[PDB]
Design a protein around this ligand. Structure first.
Ligand SMILES: Nc1ncnc2c1ncn2[C@@H]1O[C@H](COP(=O)(O)OP(=O)(O)O)[C@@H](O)[C@H]1O
Ligand SMILES: Nc1ncnc2c1ncn2[C@@H]1O[C@H](COP(=O)(O)OP(=O)(O)O)[C@@H](O)[C@H]1O
Ligand SMILES: Nc1ncnc2c1ncn2[C@@H]1O[C@H](COP(=O)(O)OP(=O)(O)O)[C@@H](O)[C@H]1O
Ligand SMILES: [Mg+2]
Ligand SMILES: [Mg+2]
Ligand SMILES: [Mg+2]
Lengths: 7, 370, 370, 370, 7, 7
């Protein structure tokens, strides 16, 4: 979630 | 009747008829297996998916590749793909007419034997035979003689052909292809801050690569100007509206291909590989070979790969002999054009391994017809 | 050879036969017991009341909800309700009628085991089965993809599904459907001057919120325009003949639904948890779910909840992704319609949990077959 | 003129000195913010708590873990935590002693740059440096080569090293840590009957996990034994006074850590990725890495994981490759011990990153030098 | 309240 | 990896 895209 | 061709690449499978300049089935080779039990009874059948359907849906299920680095691993998935391309895509029985197969150089004779055995047993084809991607690509390009560099999804190689005579101790191959390219792309993108770890994400980044990746000319200066300026970078839109940006990975991945040291594999680049393959021959033929260097495959679909390659091979070679590299826009289907023309001509007919020969001598006979 | 369905809600319960498109017998799932000991002899008095009888005569009977937040806590009252709805409202013997049950996604396995054991033993039915309200609410509309947000009387949740395959790692559940809402409405009415603490008063508040209260779009702007202009103050009559005016409570109640902080919780609103559940899903199904997102449940009947929900989800979601929330009429019965359709489907018959399986492997068989 | 060190793991920060042989300051990396309003005065009630205070009092405020999966999201919270661990825990000054931070592989260069920029501009530290927890644990254990497998509350990963030489192509990462493990445990407890949704409840769940959860050898056999008998069931006490019972979750949690399919994550297991990384190395070091395989981190403190990992890896790999897992009794602070040793070493001094060097070149020096 | 512990 | 030994 905190990868600016995926996860 | 007529003939049929079906090239099985590490990433894709391209099958069609003969005598045509364009294939029909161009589809990826991947088996989709759901990762969830499913609760709805209405639409829950078709456990395993094959073809473009497994690409239209790839999240709720995992994708497995049947071919890795050109070598087959799951005969079950391979025969599934064969049945799909025969009865669903082509919608033509295999017993009616024979088909042509493909196999990269230096591949296991055991794998070739298993391929021909399955083809003659399960489908009960009257005749069959396998060829090489390089010779087919060269015959498609139409050049008289020279060196051919073919790089698919998981395998790359270069081979010379002169005076209508192959050279066993001249071929040079490597397992570095689009697969390791997209792997390193995922790694450098994780470095950037994003993340792509699963198989659907692997295919998404593969699409991103084949869409917006270009090669450079001077690696150091290009990296410097990319780190300084921000005009070359570009943004991409994901299916869910999310947006990403790329400023240096696009032209760093081609350098990764040119510099296997980044991947960690202690080997030589494609330019040094070609130079070594040429040097192992005799200079009198090397002279005419330098000007005849054809490129094929999808990995070489980068815009400007010919420029960097020719510049590097010229810097490594003497300017006393003319040099030139050619790569028409149809670097993908060239093998299919070669197979089509080879099946259309009447000579190779005699070379068709017939069902009678296989059942009276066995599959091992293929060891001589190559 | 017919079927039967009985959806047991936390607040209500709706049972009847399959095949039809609408429920047959719907009534509140409550139990009223007399509190004032001593009655006039000769006329006779019953021990306990159920169904609409309690709501009709409740000034003397204390009410009890045998279900709380989707969990069962009074098995005697549950058995009494089942007997009443199987022998009085329908007047049908269940020994020759396979029934169907419902249950929230995440609930005590012990609760499910006790439910199935009771239905198998105390009724001697041929077979039974359980399901999730989400799957039936989706079957109602017929679509097979998308996400569904259900909100009953004491429990709410959201569940995605794609091509029949559900994502259990994305399901979300909360205990804010109508009970904390009724409690907060009582609190705000006490703040206004009107006191409501008993059970009959609780049903009165349930009715007044069902009839009057509605959600808004801009909470702050609506509060301001209501405090300034007295155009929203609406009057409601009571069984005695009085009249009571209500203002900003109609906004504060759905606002409490969206902001549990007013109730004393730290969890986020329905929109935030829905976006989180969709985030844990892959990107392709994320896109496919943003379009088809359905809302169901009795609590969902608030006028103006779809527009506000889509506004919030768009504000918190990226652009270039059309979000078409759907909320058809008669949605509070969507679970019943889905259950009826499932029971009518011939294939689903094979999934029935018979009596032999229970007698052999005990009630735990419910899990394996689910 | 001594130095210090501070690991900023997502689970809890651990700061200490170099000359020491064990960490002195250690506390969770959380930040609590009150959700209520507060009425009483004179108590000096602050607005944002950090450290053991938010752990002692957690039912009146919402907690936040600023670092998620090894990535920072709340730089203000990280600065607050650094101030607390530099001034409150141990009364020292940053300008007087050089610092030494640590991070995980593949961490964003932007994250590293912001970290160093904050550390330089806010505290005006003389010198600093960044390293990788794997080589830190190696230097702590005293060995030089081997394959490190670290697993913290934030993320997990593994990397091989040969005579100080790393192999980025062999590094492998994974986001299966205590957070998602506790989430899955709370979900399974909800399925069992016990509910835990809030942050304080999540902390209680983490505590009961680290206290009870134990990995098993044969998952199916243990599940059968648990479902058959009850000798494995354990009882835990809560602050409310009531007790709870636990059955198979204690080993289903580490099995989810081993089988991401239980949580809904398409990836490989810890042993699978370890073997994959080992296979990507050179044959002349495969054996040396098999025997010199060391584990670290707090998440891997489960009892019985060493034997389980050994059995799995030796059954997956061939024979004549004797394995010796290094799982010493102290591993939660092994990284800190290695950091203290490296800081006390002499040569490492010349490898410091000073303040004037950063002011001249910039923050990019952090990823350009180490 | 009816979860044998919390709530 | 799929060469029964190296790679
Ligand atoms: N437009 C493009 N730009 C860059 N790379 C491409 C492009 N199209 C295809 N590719 C790459 O080429 C590969 C396909 O190889 P292919 O030529 O099908 O091998 P084969 O000849 O064995 O079938 C893919 O893995 C993809 O990464
Ligand atoms: N028209 C309406 N407006 C507002 N709320 C309603 C309306 N109709 C029903 N409700 C609320 O919905 C609840 C019924 O929940 P229900 O959907 O029956 O749960 P379940 O799906 O578990 O049976 C009641 O408690 C009531 O407060
Ligand atoms: N004795 C134990 N048994 C099981 N798990 C433990 C034990 N001690 C700590 N843990 C787990 O390890 C985690 C701490 O991770 P840690 O090693 O501090 O990460 P980092 O290395 O990033 O600081 C905690 O979340 C806890 O759940
Ligand atoms: Mg190819
Ligand atoms: Mg409900
Ligand atoms: Mg850690």
């Amino acid at each position: 979630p905190a990868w600016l895209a995926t996860c | 009747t007529t003939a049929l061709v079906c090239d099985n690449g590490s990433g894709l499978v391209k099958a069609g008829f003969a005598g045509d300049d364009a294939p029909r089935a161009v589809f990826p080779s991947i088996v989709g297996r759901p990762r969830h039990q499913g609760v709805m009874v209405g639409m829950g059948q078709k456990d395993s998916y094959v073809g473009d359907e497994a690409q239209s849906k790839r999240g709720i299920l995992t994708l497995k590749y049947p071919i890795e680095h050109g070598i087959i691993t799951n005969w079950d998935d391979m025969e599934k793909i064969w049945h799909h391309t025969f009865y669903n895509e082509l919608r033509v029985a295999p017993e009616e007419h024979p088909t042509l197969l493909t196999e990269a150089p230096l591949n296991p004779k055991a794998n070739r034997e298993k391929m021909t055995q399955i083809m003659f047993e399960t489908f009960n084809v009257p005749a069959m035979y396998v060829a090489i991607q390089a010779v087919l690509s060269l015959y498609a390009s139409g050049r008289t003689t020279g060196i051919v560099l073919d790089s698919g999804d998981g395998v790359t190689h270069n081979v010379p052909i002169y005076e209508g005579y192959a050279l066993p101790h001249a071929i040079m191959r490597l397992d570095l292809a689009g697969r390791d390219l997209t792997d390193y792309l995922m790694k450098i993108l994780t470095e950037r801050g994003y993340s792509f770890v699963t198989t659907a994400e692997r295919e998404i980044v593969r699409d991103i690569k084949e869409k917006l990746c270009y090669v450079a000319l001077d690696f150091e200066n290009e990296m410097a100007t990319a780190a300084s300026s921000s005009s070359l970078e570009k943004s991409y839109e994901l299916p869910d509206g999310q947006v990403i940006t790329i400023g240096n990975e696009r032209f760093r991945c081609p350098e990764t291909l040119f510099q296997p040291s980044f991947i960690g594999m202690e080997s030589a680049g494609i330019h040094e590989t070609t130079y070594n393959s040429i040097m192992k021959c005799d200079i009198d033929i090397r002279k005419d070979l330098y000007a005849n260097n054809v490129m094929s495959g999808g990995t070489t679909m980068y815009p400007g790969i010919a420029d960097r390659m020719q510049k590097e091979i010229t810097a490594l070679a003497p300017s006393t002999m003319k040099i030139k590299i050619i790569a028409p826009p149809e670097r993908k289907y060239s093998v299919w054009i070669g197979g089509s023309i080879l099946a259309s001509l009447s000579t190779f007919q005699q070379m068709w391994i017939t069902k009678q020969e296989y059942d009276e001598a066995g599959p091992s006979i293929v060891h001589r017809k190559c």
